[PDB]
Structures are given as structure tokens and as C-alpha cells.
Amino acid sequence: EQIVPFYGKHQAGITTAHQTYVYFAALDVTAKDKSDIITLFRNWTSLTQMLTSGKKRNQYLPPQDTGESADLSPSNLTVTFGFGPGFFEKDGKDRFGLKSKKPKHLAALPAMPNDNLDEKQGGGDICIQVCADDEQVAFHALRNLLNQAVGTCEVRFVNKGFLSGGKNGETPRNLFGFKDGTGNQSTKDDTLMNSIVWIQSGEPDWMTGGTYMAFRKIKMFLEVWDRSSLKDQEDTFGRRKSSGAPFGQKKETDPVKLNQIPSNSHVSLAKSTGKQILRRAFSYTEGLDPKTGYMDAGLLFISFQKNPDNQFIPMLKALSAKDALNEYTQTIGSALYACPGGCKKGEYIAQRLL
Amino acid sequence: EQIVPFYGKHQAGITTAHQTYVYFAALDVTAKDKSDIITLFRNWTSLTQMLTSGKRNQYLPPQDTGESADLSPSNLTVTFGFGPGFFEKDGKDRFGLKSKKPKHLAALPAMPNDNLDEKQGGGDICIQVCADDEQVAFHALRNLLNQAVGTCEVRFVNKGFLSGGKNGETPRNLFGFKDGTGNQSTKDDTLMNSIVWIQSGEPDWMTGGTYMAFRKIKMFLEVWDRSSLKDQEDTFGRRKSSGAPFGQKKETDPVKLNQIPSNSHVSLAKSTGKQILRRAFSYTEGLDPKTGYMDAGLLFISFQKNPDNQFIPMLKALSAKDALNEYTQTIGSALYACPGGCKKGEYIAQRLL
Ligand code: HEM
Ligand code: HEM
């Protein structure tokens, strides 16, 4: 029962229970003909469906499967696809006749204070989010999906993350030791998810049942953070580190009292925007940082909103300019993708290409 | 019941059951006084014992970074070793330990198909953090590395994974082959004492210890995935799906050497007549600049009581004629001497006194 359904009204991996491991990849389409892209997505639909279920010769041919996931369980594997702005208009030229179908809010995220964006660390035409409760299962799924795109796409970047939840179900803690996700509404609340995440109208029909996905690769200066006092740490966020409770409250789930937390507190500024998003982030570590000599670690920030201009960008502007966490963080990758709606069993992903 | 004992006759993490995740780090000692190193090892012993088992001033930084608070120890083990530079660095013996150097501790010989990065191998101290949860393991490494600031400088930090079968099958590496069939059973004390554990002939601090070989081997996943199934099985000498040697039925059947290729990986290794305890992990590190492909490979880690007799012969054989050379390139190399176990009232490598 470790299988997450692939076909559905929405794509899996958004309101799906947060897995432990993620591989996050972005592709740039190198094919000139649109029919190559339809071929891509057709084989991706077939492969993803095989990978997300338990579906398991000519010795002179390559094996159709790389093989490292053979004895493993699906471990709640989900794969989520999205389109960046470059898929519809690249350098002003709309190369596949899709400019008339561009999502209404799909564009590069605005530059923000404290940005240190690496251009090849964000963007892309296609993004693939592979989530699973086992890293080998997840890398295996991404590896075999990327192999299908050779000749059609060029891999732009590949990110890799983790986020462990509590043994008794406690909110998972990020690399600063604070629980991450209390502020999210319940993914089992259909009304709120339809109000925060899922699109019903106002978009091209392929976005119905879809959403927007924001990606920010945020470096976390662990060495500076670990020298900061516990009180300094609790004051940057506005919650007690151990319990995850707001200031002046008892438990994690008590409501936030804004007049009880600092003005430049992370939670204060975000909740003060009046907007909500669905945060589904993962932590990352990447060895040492050259010239820095410290652990290169941080957060792969991923959130889903039906209107990023109303829900995400106001929060980004607020946090970018005034935020105690900026003292310990620097965003180095940025991207916004449009996720199509779900895939019915007889169709292929994003079948608006026809 | 997810706890691996830290105190013992040997260090944990060598013959201990292979966990899923590893963080592998190497440090260079920047401290000039040997007593700063003794302090470091004491606090490392104290912290490690708290970390590997289950375990107040808001104005001070937290003594624990906290991200593992709600997690199980998940068989966390931490294993320590010393590189050659700890005993003699640039001709200088910096801590009066040259008279205590292990007999077989030295940099590994340069090999054909080597492409070594100097800062991807070597080091004076190595720390191996293994656990069945990556967050648990990184947390253990993070807080151990925090205690070394001002005493050591971190040389490199590697990060790996290796998942075993849902029903206990041998874990498969990123080439899809079962990896570990050839190791003796780590529950055979007689075999482990003959392959891994040191009994005599070494300084007393190595009694119950071993040597640890580290080879960071890049795996050209893109070349391998385009190769025929015949190329893949012929490079190893075992069937990919079953893990069986050629002309044999099951994975654990003995290898028939006259039925696998001469330059086969299993042929060359088995032909040395030597054995080691292989405890490796797979790694992935994003894309490779200039290559544009997945940067992945194997963190080769193995334990031998005599690297000059057991490991170096196998390296020479494989370096020259291994069919795996077509899909792999070693980019990091290191050999560490791991001290023996730690009794409850002592600290790691207490021979420093
Ligand atoms: C390294 C980067 C970040 C870290 C470590 C971090 C951590 C946290 C923590 C500990 C909380 C409080 C617990 C919770 O509500 O889950 C929180 C809340 C929140 N964060 Fe972040 N966060 C980061 C980046 C961001 C970014 C980039 C955004 C938006 C652009 C964002 C939006 C929010 C929101 C909306 C909340 C909930 C506010 C509420 O309670 O109503 N976070 N974050
Ligand atoms: C990317 C690098 C490597 C890969 C993918 C790899 C993989 C494998 C595989 C699939 C086997 C057969 C199953 C088994 O016996 O466990 C094997 C056997 C073995 N390999 Fe490796 N290996 C690599 C590097 C090395 C290195 C660097 C050494 C030694 C310097 C080594 C020594 C051995 C030994 C001793 C055996 C068992 C021989 C026997 O069957 O008696 N391997 N390896």
C-alpha cells in the first residue's frame, strides 16, 4: 500500500503527503518540432505510470531499465511536471505556437533584495519533481525519465533534497531545527486547497486542476546560525524552537499572536501579508563551498499557489526587504513553473499540445 | 531497538549492518598543540555516545542543532580514522606520534586511469557517519564538525546512499548489479578477524582496529545506460538480474573463473586470492560542468587488516585491466588507520597520552 496513484483529477506530489526525499530537475527544450515534445510527454506518461506502481530479451541492446530500483518498493513515488515561461516564448520568439495558451501568471519571478541568483540554477522550460520515501527509488525514477528526453531536451540543473518527519508524526524540522509546515492548511481540506492551490477557471483549460509552482534555492549559513543564541534563533522566526509554538502560546498549533512576535519576524511578515501558499519544501546539502570552506547547505523552497501574483509575490517582496532570516540566508536559484491539471487514464500529460 | 552500541571491542560501522545513508568527511589538523587534539577527541567521544543512542540557556547557542530531535537514532554509527598526514606532514612529525605510526599507513600508489583531485582525498582525520535516515546522519556529522572549529579544517564532505532489497536482497549500485555478494558474513567472527580486525604487529591502539580504504569512483551513467546488456554483464562476470556468476544458478554460487572474461571485474579481483570487507555507498551530485551529465558514482569504502597484502594487490589488478575502467574514473583516494574500540571510561584513540 506504498503506492500513490499517478492518474487523477490533479497531479500527485502537490497535496500528496510530503515524502522524505526529492530530486528536482529542470530541462531546456532543444527540439525544434512540436511533435517531438508530444512524443516526449507520451513516453513520460507511460514510464511515470509504470514507476509509480509495482509494474516490473536481446543481449545486444541496452536494458530498457537501469535496474537499481529492482528490489525496492515504490515508496510513495510521485512525479510532478511543470512548464516555465521559456516553454511558450523563448527570447521573444514563440517557438511552438503555444503563446496563445500561456498561463495568465507565468513569468520570471521579480528580482528581490538579497538575491544572489545563479541563472543556470533556476529557470528552465520543463521542471520535474520526483518525490519518494527512499532516495534510490527517487533517483532511479528521475534517471530513467531523463534518459527518455535525450535528443529532445538538455538538462539545466538537478537538485536533491530531504526532509524527515517525526517518528510519531511530528512536523518535520528544517536544517535550522524549527518545524517547517505548521502554517500550511490541511491538504485534506478540499475547500482550502481549491482556494489556495487548485485552479478552476480563468486559465487555459490545461491549467484546470493544475497550479503554479514556485522554486527558490535558498542557501542557509549553518555556521553563522549555529553561533547565534537560541533566543536570537527563536526571534528570527517568532516561534519557540523546541515546541514550534508561537510566542506567548503553549503548543505548535496555537494561533499566532502578531503583537507577541517581532515586527521583522519571519512568521510575522509572512502571515501579515494576508495571503497563503502550500509550502512543500526539502532541505539540501552539497558538500563544502569553495572559497567559503563551509558546508554548502540550505532549503529547496517549493510552494504551490493558484495565483502567484496575489499569493506568493507579495510574501516574497515582504520577506526580501525586511526579515531577520535574511541574516542567515541568500537565495541562489529562482523559478516559476505552471503545472497542468491531472491526467486521465486514457491521456498523456499536458495533452493541450494537440 | 534502532541503536547500535558505540562502546565495544571494535568501532561500530565496520562490521555493523550496512545502513542506507553515509556522510563521509575528512579533516586537516590546524592545531599545533597535541593537547587540543586530546580535548577534541574527548568531546567527540562524549558527543558520539549521546548521538548514537537516545538523548537550557536561551542566551547561548544551542549545544545541539536540533533537526534530529523527533527522529529515531536509526542505527547511527560514527567511525574515526587517521590519515598519514596525522603522523608526518611535509616531513614534520607534528605531535610526537611518528613512533606510533601504523606499519601499513601511507598514501595509496598512483594507478592507471587515476584522475585524482587532491582535495577530494587525503586528510589527517576521517569521520564516517552512517544511518538509515539522511537527516539523522547529517545532523550527527554537523554537530561533530562543530566541535572541531579552531582545531581542524574540513577538507571534503561526501554524501551517499545504498538501499537494500525490500525482502533482504543484496543492495544494487547505480549500475543495477548486486554489490556485496563476495563479502564474507560479518557475523563470522573468525572470518572477520582474518579479513578486518587487527590482533598484533601494530601499535597497541590499533588492536581491534583496521585500515580503511577510500576511493571516490565517478560512474559514467550515460555511457553505461547506452551499453548493451551483454557489455554490462561481461564487464562484471555476473548476470545483472540474479547476481549469479556466469554458468551458475544463484547469486551465492561460487564463481567459475574459466567461465567469465579475463578482464572481468570479478575475475581480476577474485584472481588476486585476497579478500577485503567492502562497505560502499552510491552518490549523486547534480550535473557535471563541461560534461552536462549526471555526476554520480560510488564511494568505495573497504576495511582490511593489511592494505599492502589485501587491498593494494586488488587495486593494481583492477587499475590495469578492469573492464569497469571504460565506465569509471577514480577522482578521490585516501587510506586511514581506524583505532580499536573504545571502552566506556576512555576516549577514542586514547594512545595520544
Ligand atoms: C531558508 C528559507 C526558509 C526557512 C528556513 C523557513 C522556515 C519557516 C519556519 C520555521 C516557519 C514557521 C513554521 C511554519 O509555519 O511552517 C515558516 C513559516 C512560513 N514561511 Fe518560511 N521558511 C523559509 C522560506 C520561506 C519563503 C521563501 C517563503 C515565501 C516566499 C516562506 C513562507 C512562509 C509562510 C507563508 C509561512 C507561514 C506563515 C503563517 O504562519 O501564516 N518561507 N517558514
Ligand atoms: C565503480 C566502482 C565499482 C563497482 C560499480 C563495483 C561493483 C562490483 C560488483 C557488481 C561486484 C560483483 C558482486 C560482488 O561480489 O559484490 C563486485 C565484486 C568485487 N569488487 Fe567491486 N566494484 C567497484 C569497485 C571496486 C574496487 C575499487 C575494488 C578494489 C580496489 C573492488 C573489489 C571487489 C571485490 C574484492 C569483489 C568481490 C570479488 C569476489 O567475488 O571474490 N571493487 N564489485
Numbering used by the authors:
A (entry chain A): 56 to 111, 117 to 414
B (entry chain B): 56 to 110, 117 to 414
Excerpt from the publication:
In BsDyP, the heme cofactor is partially buried in a predominantly hydrophobic pocket lined by the conserved proximal ligand H326 and catalytic distal residues D240 and R339. Access to the heme from the surface, as defined using a 1.4-Å rolling probe, is made through a distal tunnel and an open wide cavity.
We deleted the N-terminal sequence of BsDyP to achieve homogeneous preparations of recombinant enzyme. The wild type crystallized in the trigonal P3121 space group with two molecules per asymmetric unit. These two subunits have an r.m.s.d. of 0.31 Å between Cα atoms. The catalytic D240 and R339 residues are part of the tunnel, and three water molecules were found in this pathway in the wild-type structure (and four in the 5G5 structure). The wild-type BsDyP displays a GdnHCl mid-point concentration (where 50% of molecules are unfolded) of 1.4 M, and the native state is more stable than the unfolded state by 7 kcal mol−1. Furthermore, the kinetic stability, which quantifies the amount of enzyme that loses activity irreversibly during incubation at a certain temperature, owing to misfolding, protein aggregation and covalent changes, reveals that the wild-type enzyme is clearly more stable than the variants with a 4-fold higher half-life at 40 °C.
